[PDB]
Structure formats: structure tokens, C-alpha cells
Design a protein around this nucleic acid. Sequence first.
RNA 1: GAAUCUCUUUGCCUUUUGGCUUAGAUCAAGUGUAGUAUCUGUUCUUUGUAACA
RNA 2: GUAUGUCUAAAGUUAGCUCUUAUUUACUAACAAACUAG
Lengths: 295, 49, 255, 242, 88
Amino acid sequence: YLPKKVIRNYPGHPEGTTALKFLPKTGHLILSGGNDHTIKIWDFYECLRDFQGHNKPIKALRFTEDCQSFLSSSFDRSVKIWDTETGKVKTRLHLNSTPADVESRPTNPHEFIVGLSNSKILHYDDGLVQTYDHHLSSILALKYFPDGSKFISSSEDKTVRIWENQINVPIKQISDTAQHSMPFLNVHPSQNYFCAQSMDNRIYSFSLKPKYKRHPKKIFKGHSSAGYGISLAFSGDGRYICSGDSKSRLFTWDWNTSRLLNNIKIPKPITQVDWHPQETSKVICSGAAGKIYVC
Amino acid sequence: KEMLAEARARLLNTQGKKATRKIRERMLEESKRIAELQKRRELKQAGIN
Amino acid sequence: SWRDKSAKVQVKESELPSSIPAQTGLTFNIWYNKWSQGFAGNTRFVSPFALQPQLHSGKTRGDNDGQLFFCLFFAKGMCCLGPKCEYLHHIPDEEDIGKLALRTEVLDCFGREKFADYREDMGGIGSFRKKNKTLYVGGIDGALNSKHLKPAQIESRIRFVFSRLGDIDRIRYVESKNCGFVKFKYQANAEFAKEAMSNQTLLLPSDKEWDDRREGTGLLVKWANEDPDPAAQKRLQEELKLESLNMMVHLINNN
Amino acid sequence: EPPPNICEQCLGDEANIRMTKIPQGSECKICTLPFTLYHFKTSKRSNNIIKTLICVRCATQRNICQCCMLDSRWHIPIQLRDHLISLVNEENVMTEEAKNDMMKRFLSLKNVKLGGAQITSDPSEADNIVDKLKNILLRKSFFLYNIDASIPEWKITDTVSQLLGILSLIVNHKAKCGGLRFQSSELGERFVSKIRGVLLIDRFRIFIIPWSSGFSAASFGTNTAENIKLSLSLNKLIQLEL
Amino acid sequence: ISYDQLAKLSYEKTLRNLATQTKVQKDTKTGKITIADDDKLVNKLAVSLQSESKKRYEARKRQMQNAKESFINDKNKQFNEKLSRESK
RNA sequence: GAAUCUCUUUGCCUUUUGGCUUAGAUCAAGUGUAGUAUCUGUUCUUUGUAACA
RNA sequence: GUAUGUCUAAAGUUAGCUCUUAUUUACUAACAAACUAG
Ligand SMILES: [Mg+2]
Ligand SMILES: [Zn+2]
Ligand SMILES: [Zn+2]
Ligand SMILES: [Zn+2]
């Protein structure tokens, strides 16, 4: 159901809290990577621990479906896999470039994908496995398919390339003459749609078909998402879409008509937006303030 | 239907391919420029001057 | 002191390295004396020669000839003709910069020509428009050969190094940006220190990496910008107004 | 073909000076246009060769000479004479120096005297601003407290050297504190004899401490957040002295 | 009509606009004329010129709004309007 | 009686065709794989009350 | 396949409607059965 009130405080960093995600199917923890400090976890209310071993801010903090360890994508050319129970050192990927969002394949805890900003993507195990070089620009955001087995990449170019399980060659590369880029993108939880932000202030939605062409009128236009790395979100079993903006506002969306529902005035560009997989009406958001406002 | 749709595709062909690739290149300039400002706004909320 | 003794041969003619640079390409371009068909690996290097002022200062032919332009290869520490070099092989003191008062805003203290504005890299000879005294000191990473040090020790090393090169106004190492800002009493001391600590190392001989001294890439001494905090703009404006009031007195005494 | 602006200080204290003209010598160091370059020697046996480094139009646009790059009338820098004209007329007369190449050429070819050149050009307004200037002027280690940021290290060396007869020194300006260091045993005894006493540099008071610890710069602080905090606490300690 | 008559009529219109609304010193050396200009009159002229520019701006947008013979893009329907105005 | 706002018409062209020559010249004779684009066929949906700080 | 164009930290500048799915058609390919470019 729709979020309508700015309910709880959750005062995180005084810095940005530049990444928020959930444990899938168990809405117990969150993550918050600030600018200067390190990662904090809030529950539901409570706090657990810091994760020292970073120096720079963090782009994205992605879990696995094993859920015991998340993946930190810091600006400091270093990717660290942290346990949510102890917080130890599995790997330390000292890289060449500032890494983008760092994700994991839903089957294996071994299979593990790191995006870069020198136009490359590196697959790993529990240790290089296979490169990925088809984007011309810095790669911005990644996804996967239902239960993995393929892979989705999008860059500072307008291209989106579906790569496979350890295969360099794209099945489809998605480009027109009017697309700005695809800076962030999340799988719609019926695992057949394909939603992505784009800096025409619009959220495009493609299919997941072999005949992969887009569907009209499912484009979410009323935004100011132009110059910030803003996230997408999806409710339980796909009832709405929440997405932040740079008006210090959070905007929700329908599916069949795709129209504006709630223009909230949350007290700085609202960027990171997550739903609960348990609570069917509440949405966690954070902008660049650090105070994690829950709707 | 096919021939009429191709005809109304070709009657829209107003700009040349050099003007088409210049609209393409200016679109790429605006996209790279807004990505650069996006990266700078991230690093400026970060504090890295 | 240095007024008493003569200047030493810092290096032989045969003990200089060749003018042909380190090979960064395929073939050698003998017009521009550089390398081409490839650019991978740094042209920049740790300089093999240091200054060592108190040992190698002295009285040259330049004191006999009455010339008061200093020696660019004394500051680099790589003169062959020690006591016979036409330029000066000592630290710029107050009286030498005082005799440089007629030409140091046109040329520098080495006889090089000051240009219109700075480079895009802010490093080189300098301007005739800014009375520039503050030197940016970067490149400290390879100057330490990427050794983990506290910032107070590095600030102490930069203070002791640039104390050899004349009178110091003010040194402030930036812990957040890994750079210093060394301001001098005179402009010619800043010029001499920029030529002096060009691409050397902050490594002491008391450390284990002294054999691998010339491995990485050394210091980066360059001309600095203004100090953009308003307190140093305040001290800059008031010291410039006091020097202007001195020049007020001079212009009234003249006419 | 205009004759050059070279003032009385560049040529020097001689009456017969032989200069060498090269037509279209080099690009001038303001606008990068070529010009007739005049190089000479101040004496006959001078070791330094002195050449004009700007063209005649860039010289007359700033009312400066071509060799020593100072004012033709006053023999002072351009920036400071613009600052003095801003002190007089209450109008920020600044010299608009170019940075693009085409802007340099464009800004030199135009017939104008830019900056503060028009005031010092004719001697009437020169002496007018001169008596306005007259109207304006009618209107073995130690630790150191109380060093405001306008006090350099070289003045702290010079006053201690002047009170003695002539030794390194370490001053943290962001901590606003000072320290002095040497090796001679008798030099510290003579520093005690020539006096927490007060150093008076320019009426700005600096308190002294016999600092038995061997201070490094780490003793003044390890970071910049320690320096401002220690400066505030030490100014409160100075208020405790007062 | 003509640019002379049209300047004359716009002058009469602006005097009608004032009708709906309603010293000199010199130096010795510089010789530049300092005229005392009242601030209410200065910014009243400024607000009047901005109001005329915005009035012309909104009327020009009103002409831009109207779309009612054969054309491919917007510049083309403007050119076809021009040919329809040539046909008398 | 003095004037504001909204329309209608006229006038200004307002995003208003910015060179030339031999119309400047000549026009598929396949397939498979793939990509892009479009049509058609097919299936689904329609608040009071009390206490405490 | 050329011309040609574009990207590339080593160095740190001071606080009717929504949909799945197949057939057809159109334009493209130095991709295949030793060589061909403005
Ligand atoms: Mg051709
Ligand atoms: Zn020498
Ligand atoms: Zn010039
Ligand atoms: Zn001169």
C-alpha cells in the first residue's frame, strides 16, 4: 500500500548515507554507507555495529541471497565483502578504477560481479574469473535475472547489455538516439519487467523477453532525477514504484496508468529508496542528509 | 500497410544523416555533461573537492 | 660560512647522466630530444643529485665577475665546473636578493624569463604579475616511496629541508590533501627552492629504503595559488597594504 | 616605428649606452606579438644582458617600461600602483590581464591605456594623485606563546638573532605556537641573559618558555583539528595570565 | 504603415502609458555630466519596460499557441501559413 | 464621464525553405545466421473517557 | 575495408482495452559458401 506519512526518525550519519538496501525476504536489517564514516545497520529502533576498513564514501551495498555477507562498493578502489554476523575479511579487491555497484549471483556465494568505472566488469569467485568489456563509458549500475543465470549492465552510455553467466558477449545491447543513460535499475519482483531510471527525469520499463522491445505508456515522467544517483524501488509482489528525486521529494507510482500518487515533502536530494519485503505499506528513504526517514 | 508505413517513414526523413549524427552527438554531449555533473555532485556531498 | 671558501665540484663531467632521456618510446626524436611512438611509463623520475648547501657552497667566478644570478645546477646539485661557473653557487641571502631588486620581477634569480601567467600545471618559472612566494609541495607519495608516515613527521621533514634554502615565512602541510605550502621571506628564495627540491626525495639516509632511493617519482614543487581561506586573504591584504604604505612613503620622498 | 620605453633605472648610471635593435625580435611576454627588441648591457663590461621583454604598445597600455616592467613615472609594480590608485580614488582600478591568446592580441592592439596607466601618464594628474597620497599619509629548546598568524617565522628568527650577536626554529601557525632550537650550551645562557619573559617584535608580545622537552612538530599537534583547539585553549591560558 | 509612422505611434502609445501613470552638474577636468535622476522614476521606467516586454512576451506566446494546411514539422506549418498569407 | 481585462479584424514574420554543375551521377541478380523496426495471427485482464510525565 | 572522429589519474592547491507468443515483410553486416573502397 501507499506510503503517506514520514513516520520514524532513524538518525544515521551526519554525512550522506549514500547506500540503503534490505536483506531479501527478511526485513530485519538495513545498510547505510555515509561519506566519511563507515557502514551502520538499523533494525526493527536499534543499532548493531560499524564496519571499519573504509576511507572514502560508498556507492552501493548489495547483499547475497545467502544473506550472511554483503558487498561494499566504496570510492576508494577497494571492494570488501563483509559478514553481517561477525564482519570479517573474505576478500579485499584492490582495483584499478573506482568501482560501481558490486553485486552477487543468487545461486552461488562464489559468483560475484564487480562493476568498475574504467568501462569494465570483473566476475569473481572465492580472484579474477572473467572480464567484461563492451561498454564504452563508465559503468553505472547492474542487476540480474530471476534466480540469476544471466546479468544486466548499464553505463554512462545509454546502452544496457544483458550478459550471461560468465559470457562476455551481450545477447541484447539496448540503445536508441534519444536515451540519456540508465544510471540505476531494479528488477520488478514478478521478474518479467525491467525498470530503469534515465536522466530525462523518467523511469523506463522494458520487458525480459527474447523480443525484448519496450512497452509504451509505462513511463514515469514527473520527476527531477537529472544529476543524482537515485535508486528505484518495488513493493511486495509489484503493486507500486517508489523513487526519490532532487526536490527533497519521494514519488510513488501505479502500473496500469502510471500516474502520480503521493508527492511527499520529506526534509537535499532524496536518492536511496527501499521497500520492505515484510511490511506491505512502508518505505525507507534517505537523501544526502543522513536522517533515514521511513514512509 | 507495409508500403504505406515505409512511405510515411520516408516523408519524415527531413534532416540529413550528418544532421542526424549531429543531433546524436549533441545528445551525447548533454548526457556526458549531466553524468559529469552527477559524479561531481556525489563527490561534493562526499567532500572530495 | 660560505663567503670564506670556494665552491666545490659537485659532479664530474663524466659523472653526469646523458641528456638522452629514459626510453619511453621506440625511436629518439633528435629535434625535440624526446621519445615518440608510445606513451607508457613516466618521463618523470627521482633526481639523482641533491643540493647539500653547507658542504658545496662557496665563492665562484660569479663573485669575481660581479654577476648576481644564481646557478640552476647548484640548486639541482649537478654542476661540473664548481668554482668556475659563471653563476652563484650559494644560498640566496638578503644582500644578494637586495642586489636582485632591479630585475627579480622580470627575470627570476636564475636568469630565466618570467612569463605572462602560470601554466595549467602551475609549475615552471613564474609570473611577473604575482609577487609569488608560496610553493605548493605535492608528490609526497613517491617522495616517501609510498611509506606510511604520520603527517607531523612529514611536516618536520619538509620544514627541515626547506630551512636549508633561505628564510621561511610559513609552512603548512595539508593532512587531508597530502601537500605543503611553503611561503618564503623573498621571492628569490622561493624560486631557488623550487629549483632546489625539484624531484628529489624526503627520504633520510637513516631509513632502510636509502638504496632504493631513486625508484619512484620524487617531489612536486610548484608555484601555489592564493590561500582561499578568508583569514589568509585578510593577512595578505593587510601585509600588501602595509607594503603599499611603505611605497607611499617612497613615492612622496621621490616627488 | 615608436622608440621604446626604457626608464632611467634599467639603463643605469651611464650617459653613453649602446643598445642592439633586432627587428621582429621575439614575442612579447604579454600579448605574444613580435616586435623590435632592444638588448643592451648596463655598463660596457656588465655580465648581465638586459633586453626589452614587452612590445611598445603593451608598454604604453600599462605606462610601464619595457625592461624592468615597472611604471615609467614611478618605477613601481603594476599591481601595487593599481592598489594605490584604488586607495586614492576609492575606485578599484585594476589591470585587466588577459589569459586567452586571441584575447591577448586583441587587448594589445586597441588604442587605450588600460589599468592605472592614464593617471600616471600625464604629470599633472600624477602630481595630483601624489599630493592626494600626502593627504592620505596625513590621515636547549624553547617554546613560544601568543604568535598571531601575521607573525612569520623569519621575523622570529631575526629578532632573536638581533638581540643576540650573530639556531633553527619551528612554528606551527595553525596552532599559533612557536619553538626554538640550537646546540650550544652557552647560547641558551646568553638567551636567558638577554631577556616567562616577553619578545617584542613589532609591539606584538610573544611569551617565552624554557622547554626542557625535545619538541618536534608533533609536540605542537599531530593534526589540524588539534591545532585550532590548542590555539583556543592557549589563548584562554593567556587570558589566565592576564 | 512605415517605420517612421510606427515609431511615431509607439511614442504616442508610450505617452498614453505615462498619462495612465501620471539638475545638471559638470566637473572641471573630466567634463562628465552628472544628472540627478530620481530613484522612483528610474525603477518606474525599469518596471514599465519589463512590463512592456512581458506583455509583448505573453501576446507573442498567444500567437505561438494557435494551431488549426499540409505540413511535416512545426517550421513547415509556419511556412505553409506564410504561403497561405501570400495567396491573398 | 476617466480608465483596466477579454475577444474580433487589419499591419508587421515572429523557430518563416541560407550556393553551384552533367535534373551533379547511377539504381537489388539471390541464400543462411544475426540485429533493428513494423504489421498480422494467438492468450490473459476490465473517535470519546480516565491516569501518569 | 578505409578516410576520419571520439574515450583513457603518474602528479591530490591550503576553509474498445493491458498482455504472452508465432508467422510475414522492410533496412543493415569485410558474418560464410584470400581478393575488392570514397
Ligand atoms: Mg572521395
Ligand atoms: Zn654552477
Ligand atoms: Zn605585447
Ligand atoms: Zn625599467
